[PDB]
Design a protein around this ligand. Sequence first.
Ligand SMILES: CCCCCCCCCCCC(=O)OC(C)C
Ligand SMILES: [Mg+2]
Ligand SMILES: [Mg+2]
Ligand code: NI
Ligand code: NI
Lengths: 226, 227
Amino acid sequence: REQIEAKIVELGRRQLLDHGAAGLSLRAIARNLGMVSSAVYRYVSSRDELLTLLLVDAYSDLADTVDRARDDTVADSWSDDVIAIARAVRGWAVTNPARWALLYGSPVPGYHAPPDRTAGVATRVVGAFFDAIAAGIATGDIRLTDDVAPQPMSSDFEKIRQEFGFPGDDRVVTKCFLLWAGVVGAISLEVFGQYGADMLTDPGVVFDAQTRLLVAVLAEHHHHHH
Amino acid sequence: AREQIEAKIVELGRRQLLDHGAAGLSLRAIARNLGMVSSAVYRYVSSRDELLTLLLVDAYSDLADTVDRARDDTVADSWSDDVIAIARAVRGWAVTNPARWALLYGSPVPGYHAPPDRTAGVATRVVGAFFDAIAAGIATGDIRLTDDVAPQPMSSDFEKIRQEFGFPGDDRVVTKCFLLWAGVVGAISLEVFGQYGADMLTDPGVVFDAQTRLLVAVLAEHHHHHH
Ligand SMILES: CCCCCCCCCCCC(=O)OC(C)C
Ligand SMILES: [Mg+2]
Ligand SMILES: [Mg+2]
Ligand code: NI
Ligand code: NI
């Protein structure tokens, strides 16, 4: 089976590279497996199910890539950990541009990913960032200021904290959202070609410079609040 | 006479985006839903690529026009309020026009490359507005220029950017301009493309605005240290 479902995922991933989602076809996938259109449907019931399999696969590969890169190390500091994560995410997106598009690019209209399948893997990189930043809180380099956000943002953040076992207060969590948005934004601008013609000679150097600013956001205090 | 037909074609194209994305763009379907014949449509919009190009130009222009309107109702002391107002207007446009945002800043359309002679100008209008708001912060001294040089080749690339946008920054401020654009685009895309998920944030606009205020603090080096 999974030998079969594996091949489906591999095929579908190729159809993604070539035509994007529109061109997903349990029809093509069917021929290749020496199979009748109808035969495939037990393994993968529908175009949607294919899409969710392809999503879980991309998310997992990305997260495994990140996990691997953290196990590689200068354990020196939380900030070096954050940089290593960001660099791994970007490197993965640059090597897998169509799968980056799948994950963080345009939605497939008519498709809604059942969270029960996607939630877990979809938060593993987010989770890595939180884990990395939690180290900087435990060692005092990232100073909690007990600056409470208005509701309902504060209660939103409290759920997020509990989910991830993250000890950052409301300001740290705001800064984490900025970090993630900046990382995903920078990557997508590069990968999707949106800086355009002859603008950046080495987009990676610019990405690294952005990450360093985002680290400095986490490390310094911007309001008179003590 | 063409002009008015082209408009109904483009409006129906905007609808197909909403319903099928760039995939479902079809001049033939359009051609029907206007009680017209397929062969008649190519006379007004000659290909899928031309339809996409019209839809891109339309979207970039509407987005920029929305920014420009929001700035005209920031009547203010403040370069920072301007930056915040631009960012808010971009997000508002994107959430209200999510399929057109996808067309602009989402995944590339396989096989298609926008003609820079139709798209490049309008595509720089909002970036341009941010540089103009930020330049006012530099003029008043809230954003201080240094002689620090960004790591190469950034510094070299940045000189060409400052010239193109008539922006009187230094390297450091330009880096922070790239950060702001990335943060804005990135935050909007995560919300609009449905990564956040339904429940997580009660109003994502509120977190977004907090992020923009942090980006303003980065530009102005508004922080202190306990040394
Ligand atoms: C806060 C602003 C930061 C500025 C950095 C980004 C500038 C991106 C401009 C892209 C224009 C483009 O598409 O032109 C092509 C030739 C086609
Ligand atoms: Mg790929
Ligand atoms: Mg729309
Ligand atoms: Ni302080
Ligand atoms: Ni300082």
